[PDB]
Scaffold this active site. Sequence first.
Site, PDB file in Angstrom:
ATOM      1  N   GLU A 171       0.707  -9.850   3.814  1.00  0.00           N
ATOM      2  CA  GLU A 171       1.229  -8.708   3.053  1.00  0.00           C
ATOM      3  C   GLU A 171       1.295  -9.078   1.573  1.00  0.00           C
ATOM      4  O   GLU A 171       0.946  -8.279   0.708  1.00  0.00           O
ATOM      5  CB  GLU A 171       2.639  -8.329   3.531  1.00  0.00           C
ATOM      6  N   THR A 224       2.588   0.869  -2.521  1.00  0.00           N
ATOM      7  CA  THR A 224       3.545  -0.127  -2.963  1.00  0.00           C
ATOM      8  C   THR A 224       3.874  -0.064  -4.442  1.00  0.00           C
ATOM      9  O   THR A 224       4.997  -0.352  -4.820  1.00  0.00           O
ATOM     10  CB  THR A 224       3.087  -1.573  -2.526  1.00  0.00           C
TER      11      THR A 224
END
EC number: 2.7.1.39
Lengths: 296, 296
Positions: free
Chosen positions: A126, A179
């Site tokens: 990630e 994000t």
Amino acid sequence: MKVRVKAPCTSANLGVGFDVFGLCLKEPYDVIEVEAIDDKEIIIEVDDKNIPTDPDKNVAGIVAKKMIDDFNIGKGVKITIKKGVKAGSGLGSSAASSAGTAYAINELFKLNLDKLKLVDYASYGELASSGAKHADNVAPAIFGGFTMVTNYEPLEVLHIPIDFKLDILIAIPNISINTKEAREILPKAVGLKDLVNNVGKACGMVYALYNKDKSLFGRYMMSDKVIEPVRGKLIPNYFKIKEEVKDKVYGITISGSGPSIIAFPKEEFIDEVENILRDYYENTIRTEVGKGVEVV
Amino acid sequence: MKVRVKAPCTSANLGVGFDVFGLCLKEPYDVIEVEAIDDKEIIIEVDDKNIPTDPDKNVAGIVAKKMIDDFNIGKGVKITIKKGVKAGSGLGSSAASSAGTAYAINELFKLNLDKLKLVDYASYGELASSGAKHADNVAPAIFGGFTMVTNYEPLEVLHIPIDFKLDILIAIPNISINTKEAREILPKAVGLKDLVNNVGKACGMVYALYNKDKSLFGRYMMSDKVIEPVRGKLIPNYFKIKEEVKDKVYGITISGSGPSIIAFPKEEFIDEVENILRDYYENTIRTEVGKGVEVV
């Protein structure tokens, strides 16, 4: 020589637990197959074509390589992925693939690693891919139940099994938040009173879980004033929907960075709340707490 | 109409739980007596004349008054008070008298109030005398064990009984710190990182209590970087002592606003840790978790 796995979506933050709390969902989930192949290569296929297939860009490829390299594995692997939900929905889509891959590699190659380490590897992916561990989505995907990321480096995860019934309703809006957009919404600073409030309410939710008290859990869950008021403006009809299901749910809040909405309907009004949610968002599903990545 | 009781000291904040967490000690403790007298007079007796005997200014007098107006207590009351510790050291000395008072009143006239109501009345006193409810000290005084003040307005308190042995060492430096002065140094705004850290660590402490994990509870307790690094500078040698008993305690932090210090020594080093604390400060007491105000 292969393994097939179901990697669930997850809902992080849960109101007052920003970057700490995570709840594992049963559905939606990613289905992932990993197959050992003779040549030292990493091949990926995904039923969602916009998703990169470059092993150095796909979080699943990034996790496999790191594990293959760390454990000096000889083989390469073919990773086949059927996505449960699109990324940017606030349901830990990418985390599902990261966690699912770390868990599948561990099974296929008999690494016998404990869960915290699988979370670590999945988080490596990630991080490499988005600049942050998203450990609060990865931990629940691996452990199941409710988790708390209580230290980010070294990574520490505390797991609280959910053994009582907890119905979950998820409204998935047709917009997305990546994000970068998620960070834009974040407040610059927090007032001492809000820290105190959040610490108290978040601690009360832990108490609530140990006391199986869903009303208390849900009620405290709806108390954040640090982020929710700003994040909620990004979701059409969020506040209105919250008002309309008010007495029919134990609690309702934003799932992760959003825009998805997660609600814990009271047993007696579950169909009504589902219907109300559908009236605002066609893509609404009914689930419950999940048990984490499992071999299928 | 005579009731003799023990009001225990309490330690609030516990690092990352400021304004929320409270731990009841067994000692030090106030010894309070309340007898019913006829005249509509509130009379106060306190071993030392540094403590205001005038019923409107002495917290136990206030709790005594507001409790009768309310309940129409027939005869007045005379209260005898033997202080456990000097107020202003960070051990809930005052809340000891308030909570002790309400618990007695209720006892003496067989009213059947709720531990929480008693916390309410006791707070009324701390409030009517300082404007603040000081509930994070009064709650543990009443409830015993570990408590969390999860909502200040209205008052909500969650209790976690401490069923296992938890040794406690208290050091009381011969110094005073203005409770109020040490309110302004406190930052009024905090970074997101600190919200995340404190919520996680505090929640972890709750998890630790249910898992009876002293080690985890004490390590997370020492993780605040918002208040402790500031407040600790005003306590002679505190930082140096923390490093010195490092491996001999499960954890060590400031009790309330200081200057008193609370440590959870490991069984194996209790004598030695108490000696180190006696060498730096002069006043040390060895206790354990208390059960709150009780009839003596």
